[PDB]
Amino acid sequence: GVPTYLLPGSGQFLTTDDHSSAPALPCFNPTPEMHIPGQVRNMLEVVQVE
Amino acid sequence: GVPTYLLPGSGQFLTTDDHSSAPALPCFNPTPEMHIPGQVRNMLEVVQVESMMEINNTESAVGMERLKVDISALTDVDQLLFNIPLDIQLDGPLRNTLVGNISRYYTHWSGSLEMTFMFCGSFMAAGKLILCYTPPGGSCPTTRETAMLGTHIVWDFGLQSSVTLIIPWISGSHYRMFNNDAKSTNANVGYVTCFMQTNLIVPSESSDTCSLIGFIAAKDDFSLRLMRDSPDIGQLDHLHAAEAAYQ
Amino acid sequence: GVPTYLLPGSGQFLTTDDHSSAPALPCFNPTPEMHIPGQVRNMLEVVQVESMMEINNTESAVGMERLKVDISALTDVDQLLFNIPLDIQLDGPLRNTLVGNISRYYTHWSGSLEMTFMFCGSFMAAGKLILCYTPPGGSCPTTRETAMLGTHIVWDFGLQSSVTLIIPWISGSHYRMFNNDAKSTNANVGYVTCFMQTNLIVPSESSDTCSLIGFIAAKDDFSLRLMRDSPDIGQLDHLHAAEAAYQ
Amino acid sequence: INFYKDSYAASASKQDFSQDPSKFTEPVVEGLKAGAPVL
């Protein structure tokens, strides 16, 4: 066994956290990506339009 | 000690998880593997085998009679014989097939199908049929002049007693999904219709009614997604002798 | 901190688990190892030693008399002397043996057995026997003409006072399992029978009844699986002086 | 992640993409060519 201890914040649900989670559907193959006009990757691109 | 913290989802039991677990019997040696004929490693192999359709799913057909379609000699030309609905995720002639049964374990399906018809008349029986696949959008054609405008094959009876109509994958989307709405644009595949091309002509000493047997299978471009519990089986109570397992 | 999550089975106590645990006494130095004769590292070594069978398990036999079989001079030919049942996982002559006792700690067994019979008559006693192993499927043979059709060895008394009948592993499956059904196809091994080949002939001054001693052992192709609690020991209450350990 | 001493304790193996549908679809001693009359 690996000796461990729990830190403050253990078990909390933070809405802005960034962690991997269990896949609900294993071996699922998503639909292949198709090129779509007008891709936006940063909202600063939108604010530059008058 | 290693500083750690627990994440959301800790301690949950997910039925589709993939983790190692403690071996109950240590040092157990399983029985050595022996070669067994007919190994299957992908259920798409099973759906490629053709199985009989229940085209004659009418109240007048009992049991095995539901697995064949009777054709007789007609005195009018361009007459319709039968039609087959489209959905493999819905109840119908395609449901109780290998491809249909396996596909009803999933929610999304894609790929081309093949429908094989075997003529089971006498050797002296002659005839020409036309089998048409109609892409969705309108009503099922009721006349040959409208059905021949879609995909079709003209079948001539002869030494080769079987013909194949390919239903190609003609869909706007990559996959077709299952809902309880047969008329959705994401579920409807079209129709299949059979018409007489010329007639069924037999001599006086041959049977005047001849049976066709229809099979359906999927091609190698077929695929399934979003596994779900099959609606083809269920229980409202415990089975018999299930209590005896606790005795 | 290291982000972690708990899996199903966390905190459980499994009696067959294999994990390191905290040492209660740090820096403890165990006594140096000394060579001791008779080290055993696998229980299959113990089952290879032959142990006496209780063939004479009858109400008329008390204690040690259950470990020998008496043979006398007969006036009819081809007469049966005794039979031995098959199962090492069931109560019988083979149960209270090293191989039987060790095998009853497991559920599955495989491999060939060997049965060794020692003649304990006088030097002037002569005789010929036949020992037959019959594979399962039918009844135990009651006549020599039926028993000799299976596996057998003809034993002639002489300077070598012991004979060995090998019961080879003849099974459809890799292993034979234990259930409480002696007649199952996964448990039945066959029968052993002993018949007189010619007769037992002794002079007037020798004992007219001579004793055979039967031993059974396993060969090196023997193996056991699925360890289980032995049915040969149990308790319905606490033992004597067990309470004194708490005083 | 498998720290157990028994190999059967490991997770599921979903990396076997080998197929042979012919053993179910074409179990005939003599193969059939495309377009040629089978019978």
Added chain:
Amino acid sequence: INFYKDSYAASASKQDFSQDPSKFTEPVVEGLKAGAPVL
């Protein structure tokens, strides 16, 4: 830290700094030079 067998189970990907605002701000067939009268 992603020990799952499915790639979609991983954490969010916040490392895509590629931009092209012109497709929203200058969707014209002929580009415009600085200072020159556009019309």
Added chain:
Amino acid sequence: INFYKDSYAASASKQDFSQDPSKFTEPVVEGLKAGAPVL
């Protein structure tokens, strides 16, 4: 996985497949050959 300082704290050792059944089955000063009369 053994992070303890004492060696006896480790898990069970199930990797000893060495055997010598003869010390229990043939504890005789003179060995016996196959088929030859032992006595």
Added chain:
Amino acid sequence: IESIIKTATDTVKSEINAELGVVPSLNAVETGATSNTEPEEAIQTRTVINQHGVSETLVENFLSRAALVSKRSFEYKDHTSSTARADKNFFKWTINTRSFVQLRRKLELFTYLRFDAEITILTTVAVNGSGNNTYVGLPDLTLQAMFVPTGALTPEKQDSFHWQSGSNASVFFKISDPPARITIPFMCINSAYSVFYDGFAGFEKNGLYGINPADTIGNLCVRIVNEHQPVGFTVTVRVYMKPKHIKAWAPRPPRTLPYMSIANANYKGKERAPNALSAIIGNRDSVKTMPHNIVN
């Protein structure tokens, strides 16, 4: 022949075909082979690069899902005056996969199966209404689950000495803990389990048809370790099984009629279609009637 398939096959474009002696659309079903007519030979097609995955239909993925195989409820209380049939703080269950139909049908889609079984045990507790009409709280109880080989001695009471488990594998778990999980190896005496057995497993004629004890994993004996509380509770234990490391042989026609018993494949069917004995598929008016015809 054997090949590695990770995606659906691509489509190649095709042209007009007017070749004499070539009839790709004609087949011979009587040989038992499946039609080999390609879409390229039936119609005129375009070039399509197919990137659709096939990993979700893998037999491992298709079967390696935790499915409920046992559900047993029993009363945790003082059982001095209880009947003989009642489960007195403990129960024993012969492990089988034929009690719940969703997993049973999927397993019966094949003739031979070889897999290890991951077992998950989930425990729930409620306060018994009768007697204790008031709710006082749920106790965190310790449960012992002992694996006993088929036919071996099972405990006869909650405090039986057989629970000492000298060699039997036992797992102790709390209700407040996550569900207990173990892995039972592939333990058949043969190289694979027999999903269907066309024979009798006894050397006489009074045996059981279709039941091969070599295919029974064993017995699970579950007890409450804690002695009874002054009030009674109802404890429900759910056992889920997940096959893993699966090998499958000889796929079979799926079950159509509802199951009748866990001991055989007896069939009755529904009173009317669908899934009736005389009509598996629901009826329509005629073979010329489209059930869901689009009318605009």
Added chain:
Amino acid sequence: IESIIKTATDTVKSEINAELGVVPSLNAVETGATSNTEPEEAIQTRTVINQHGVSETLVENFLSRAALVSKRSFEYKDHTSSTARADKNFFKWTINTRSFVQLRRKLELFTYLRFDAEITILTTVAVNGSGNNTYVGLPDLTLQAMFVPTGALTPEKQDSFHWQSGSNASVFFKISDPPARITIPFMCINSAYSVFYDGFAGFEKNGLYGINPADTIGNLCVRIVNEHQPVGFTVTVRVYMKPKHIKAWAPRPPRTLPYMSIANANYKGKERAPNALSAIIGNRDSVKTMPHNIVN
């Protein structure tokens, strides 16, 4: 001679044998050797490649199973008016392996044993029925388990100062925690434990036969750290032991008759067979009677 054996031995095919002077089926039991007749020399055999493993019969695997060695129940309450014999919120147990027969018989299958002992402690609690006829809930109590060497000073009460444990190893554990686990090393003054002792461990003639204190691991003193609650409870402590790193010498005949005491090997046997003094094996009608003969 010594050899590494991982699988059962293969079988070689054999032919007809008609050699003079060669009698592989004849043996001499009087020498004390086990018969060496091979199946190849008794019958005609085929070639068999044996892949059956032998790892489950390893002595380590055979003995490294957690088995119940102690079970003690005591009342956690106010003990001012209790009797002297009652366990007042604490108990002391001399560690032994002879109280529960399933582990004792397996350990007595050998003459000499050397192993470290993994100790697991499982605690259960119930509300005492008498006095508190109503259930109020189970308290999460802290328990202290102190290892005291054989013959040393053990605590005399729950709040004894001996519990301070200056040098004695002590483990504190909650009921809501997983069962407490420690590892006691091989602590015999000799190179191995004596499972059987044919002698007396005292220099006079009034000692105890068969009891060697050098083979006693020690004493376990278990107390409830919490002071008593206004209501009484019943606390049951179960101690399980698992040998590990095991060396075994001189295997012995297994025990047949039921055990009588933990202090000796006294025997009485059952009233009738099986396992009776005059008849270990159950009787049959005669030596010519097959107990389970197949009759069709």
Added chain:
Amino acid sequence: SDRVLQLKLGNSAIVTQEAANYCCAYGEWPNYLPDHEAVAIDKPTQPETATDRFYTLKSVKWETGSTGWWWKLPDALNNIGMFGQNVQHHYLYRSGFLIHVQCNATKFHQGALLVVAIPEHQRGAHNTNTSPGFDDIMKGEEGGTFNHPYVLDDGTSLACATIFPHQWINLRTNNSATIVLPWMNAAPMDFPLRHNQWTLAIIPVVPLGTRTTSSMVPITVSIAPMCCEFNGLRHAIT
């Protein structure tokens, strides 16, 4: 070319001029048990030509109300010739099969028979919780008939029976079917008197019909064991 076929085993030969190829179950051919898969250590007996030969069963009559026929292997051959003698004298059996089904008629006749080999066809009973008895399962040479061929007498579907090795006898196309079956069992060998590896089922999906003068149209089954081996010699059980 593929319409004519001759099968020659032992001293038996069968010729057909209206065959439609033939089926090898799962693309496999019968073979003897190899050493690396063997369990029983005694030397097996391999009678070869004495047992690997065609045995012709009693013919059945194809009627208008026929529901189908079935035979169980090795049960159907357990009391025929040297194969039956070897089965009766040996505890363990192993072999494959070669099945040839014959049915001819006139060019004015119509009818389709599905000839399917089902591995481990565990039969269920209709409208009862009691399992089928020994006499319901073991019919021997005569075989049995299908109570509900629509569900294959086991709650499954006949429409999906094509997943099993099979052929069709269509009267306008062919008059015979041939299936080659390898050994199909979880164990390398088995006791031949209590377990059946294969079940041959002949089901008239399309009923026999004609308007000529009615004649008896029988169906004949010829089964040839292949690569027979037997273990555990003892007295005959019979």
